[PDB]
């Protein structure tokens, strides 16, 4: 028996959607301290209320109390010693002080601005760690520093001339370019040295900043529509499409000297004694960089172009020399560099799948001595699972004369590994990406981390010793997925957590127990920062399940059961898909904020299936690697298998009436489904589809698919715009949605698809969101999308 | 009493129908005619007739000729053979009758050939000789020098060049374009018609050869001169339009004067160069008005037209103010231009040397409270020696509100002027008294003077040949009248057809391209014969065919023209495609096809089956197709088209509906519950207006490339009809359909939007902004784009797709 949905009018559907729409603190900082043990600073937006700086006070004892959000006036930089906060707001840079001297505020303060003699925006501000009088920023693609006390400002780099013709001005300093931001999750191009040196002479403080210089001259340009549509203009962007040139890159060191008063006596640009391209010829990208805590060595994390070969490399300051046009000066400087100064490759990761860039690298101070370096490192390529390892490298300098031009041989600068011991292991992951981090207590010799040990459906907080690794203690309660911040003193932590059934809350927990057994400290709930909002009456949590493919692989999925289900009757079904790498849709956390519309579907009597197929993350490199060089192929197989399983198990699925719908990669796969499984999928709604892989960027596309010339078959197979002949020659089976200003998945993708559909004589329906980028931010756009989708389903799913 | 239902077909079904209709049509016309008399009493041919045409077994246009016989058999039809001259393709050519030189662009280059003159006539195809250049990039807008055909002109990188075709010498004359990398830093051109001039003023050149040489310099140097427009687009707004190579994801920068914003800074200037007896270029000189153009002519926004008197005595220009309600025809003598120089001391010397009795002369002035349409007819007669007057023919519309021929005599009045002093003109500065102004034509009908229409004047016989709507607004015909003895107008073309005529320079023969709603076009040559002492009544006789009319397909059923009177008692014409295989007592679904805007007339007695085949296709599937020329449309006088002044949107739909209601009442097979409105451009605008303002009339609208917001359209067009936005906020708001999305239907499947992505007349912005507002007001829409298309859908698969989509949309959603 066939369940049909009530057909409603357009305004009826608007009423439903408008009605549904009626239905968090972050960037936490614990600070030691009356009856208050600590103050917790954070960002938040209360009920009624833009986002602002807030704090809350933790008592020494609490009753065997929901913490009040106190006001202080998207990110902020903080100096624990001085209590200096620095933050952007209202198109300027502001600062305030709390803690340290003058104790703690008991009432809101006015934020003191830092005005300038600078033209245009001041981006990517950071305080100088060694000396909080100073801070840094980028201005017209160059690095500046300034003094908050004196008001002095100094430009350090001279890459960007600021010429009239923008295409004739390719060089930047301190800047993360497009692919680095979008595909490598790095938003800065410079790094404060944490210490001052006193190089000699008058003994003036020298401060140092490592920075990436880039030259985008050879990189391809594209034009994207400006947001102010009425101007009918575009902006130019350097977009390295797969197979094209990435930027020319190079690490440099800026230094400047300061007196006792804090006045800037001098500055200088330094560069590597040989070119970066000479020393590191097979590096395509700088993934990450930083410094050892002592400032003895700068370090960088390098990637080759295929993203199969990563290196952590130390660069000492002595390896940089004054930049100069004078050839005679250059050679003199190169000659003056000690022979025992050199780069040291302290680690190398290699794989035949790909290098996922993990953020975890913790270099220990050289308590041992100057002859070696110990560090913690997240490594995935060893076991195919991301785990913590304690590595020790040997730093013995081979003689080098840097005045000579020099060609690196095989394994140049490679350090012997004295020790390499795995602190974690097993068929589960330490989470080391996209904000996940470790916290290391050198007093107790313990590493805190998050992982999927208990289950891939839940993030939990664990603890292990890095001296003599053994028992792994979990600190978080099962039946929830947890996102944790640790106090700097390792006494308390925050968990933002939820489950599929319970909306999110934010709790502070206390680590209590005998100090002589720190590994087995007990977590005890202390206070709440936010209790869970009430689940709306018209909200029914989805049900997580799992099943085993014909190839004997465990896949997880969800079902939103049709509300007011009756037995016997089969309901029309929406397969909601993403299906691409770096994502996991199915886990035990609350879906009602981001995916409310799926519940709305189910309330009208659509069944909603979600399947995390092979390619999805939190399941190890082998699982995700299944789609290597053949995107589209594996993924659809698993979507079908999961749909068929759910029909068999749950019984209320009408397989004659299935819609496939996703965004981005999900839009791509929606089209693959209709192309390759027309008898499964009656309709497709493809959001912002990738239709041609040749038109996507280097960083992402090449990682997973190689360059086009090396994988013609895979590119062609997985480029849905090339397979338009196989799309249905029946109307009302294909709806395309795309934001016009999208600068990730260019509108080009949809435009070229439509172009090919016209050439193939195929029917299509189309909706554009003229004011939207990739993600639909504006609420009217969202409502319109949702109403369009409900209408489409009610009309064209029988 | 009962409703007809259209057969619902599958998508593939509809594709079969559309693909079939394109083949089964089975419907190439030669053009740009030049008669030349043969100077051989022995041979059998009176003339050779040169033209452009796509011959048999050939896919490109080329230069062709036909031999015109001295005698023809009376009731035998001679079909003339198209001979080739040469061993897409060629779109135009310049021709010098005396020397027999042809000049034309082809294969990304310049070519030339000769036939006639002293050389005599080819009996077989000849190879076209290329003209080599050292110039980078294209050589545009070439023209032969009238005074000396050894020279020709062209534009290269927005500057004026001349060359010698014999010697091969080339010399640049203007130095406006610096050739910088950034185009925004390099905004000046010479010889070039800018966007609004081309698109909205129908002008595609910015330079004009002086027709005569002069001999200043006792060394025996000959001087040759070119009038040209110099422009500066610095202050003009830039917009970006997507490049046609989509895969590059880039745009082109364009200077787009949007209504209200800055048009280019303009000026007329004079380039001269001197030649020796060998034909070498001895010297060149950029000259400019003795005072600035902006000083002399401060109210001039646009140069519509320009040229020279036949003797080269005066350059002339047709000027327009920004409102386009004030036009002046202005004579400019070469002596008013001085050498350009940065040296201010040298400039003053030159200014001091300019005689006091050298000045401009405003020989005609046209003023209206509607708008000035630019008519191309202005013919100055030669002056007697030492005469201070100029006689000329002029087409004037604003006087009676109908475009007619006048013979004007103006008196060239010297006020006497000190050109060293900075100049400020008063009212009526340079204004020339009008001694005489005879009406050669009159009545409630038009002499056609636009969009290719022209006159031909025979100074021997004192006769002026012209085209008009005298007989009917539904047909263009060829007429003749005397400009001496104004009186009887003789018609020269056959009634029951609309005609487009080309006249021989010797007034002995002419060509007519003509057709009717029922008959496809033909091209026939006619001979004007009779006693020479009665030239007004020369008889046109069919002589030969250039192209016979194709057989009207069996599948094709001509529409029927009709007319009616509005409630205000205004006569509107319309046409009706009756549903094929009509059965009585059935009421059929109906498609209102609309354009509705100025400068167009949809309804006239000419063949619609080429351009509007799909309207017949609609009728074959059982839709009635209605077309109404309401008020606003052309060929009915300035008053009729002026109806929509400052209120576009308002009057037009009322007339469309009144006509629809008339057609239902008269014909009886119209189902008023099932009417769709469909149009492109202005028609797209109106399709949306219809749905907004008459939702009870129009069940669905299909809006092609709609104008949705008038603030986003250009100066030339928008301001002519609506003023600038600041002066007409009410009109702009009322007629901008994207500002009335709240009034669009909140029921799906009543609105389909179509737009080419590369359209650079109606920017895609229009559709984007509409969609934006529809989203904001929670309205449903369907959308189709054509990524590779500009305004007109050229590529055939795009067109088929459009047609199939339209049929599907109608068959699915045109119900009650
Ligand atoms: P779609 O799946 C991408 C939608 S836009 C987007 C959103 C987030 C990110 C960050 C990924 C992590 C960086 C290391 C990139 C792009 O298109 C993919 C083909
Ligand atoms: P649409 O009708 C724009 C069509 S593109 C075009 C075609 C012809 C001309 C010359 C004369 C203008 C009246 C047809 C210009 C532009 O209308 C948008 C306003
Ligand atoms: Cl005369």
Author numbering:
A (entry chain D): 22 to 44, 52 to 61, 66 to 81, 83 to 97, 101 to 109, 140 to 864
B (entry chain A): 21 to 47, 51 to 110, 137 to 865
Show me the paper's own sentences about this structure.
The dipeptidyl peptidases (DPP) 8 and 9 are serine proteases of the dipeptidyl peptidase 4 activity/structure homologues (DASH) subfamily which cleave post-proline bonds two residues from the N-terminus of a substrate. There, they play important roles in diverse biological processes such as pyroptosis or ubiquitin-mediated proteolysis, turning them into promising targets for chemical probe and anti-inflammatory or anticancer drug discovery.
To verify that the synthesized derivatives share the same binding mode as the parent compound Sulphostin and to elucidate the structural basis of their inhibition potency, a crystal structure of the most potent N-phosphono-(S)-3-aminopiperidine-2-one, compound 16, and DPP9 was analyzed. Although an epimeric mixture of (3S, RP) and (3S, SP) diastereomers of 16 was added, the electron density showed that the phosphorus atom is exclusively in an SP configuration after nucleophilic attack by the active site serine, indicating that the active diastereomer has the (3S, RP)-configuration, again matching with the spatial arrangement found in Sulphostin. The ethoxy group of the phosphonate binds to the hydrophobic S1 sub-site formed by V756, V811 and Y762. The 2-(4-pentylphenylthio)ethyl residue extends towards the S’ region and then bends sharply to protrude into the S2 pocket. Specifically, the pentyl tail occupies the S2 pocket, however, it appears highly flexible due to the lack of strong specific interactions with the protein. In an attempt to combine the inhibition features of the aromatic system with the observed improved inhibition of longer alkyl chains, compound 16 was synthesized and showed the strongest inhibition of DPP8 with an IC50 of 14 ± 1 nM and best selectivity over DPP9 ( ~21-fold) and DPP4 ( ~1154-fold) of all tested derivatives. The rate constants for irreversible inactivation were consistent with IC50 values, proving the high potency and selectivity of 16, as a kapp of 20 M−1 s−1 was determined for DPP4, 51,249 M−1 s−1 for DPP8 and 2310 M−1 s−1 for DPP9.
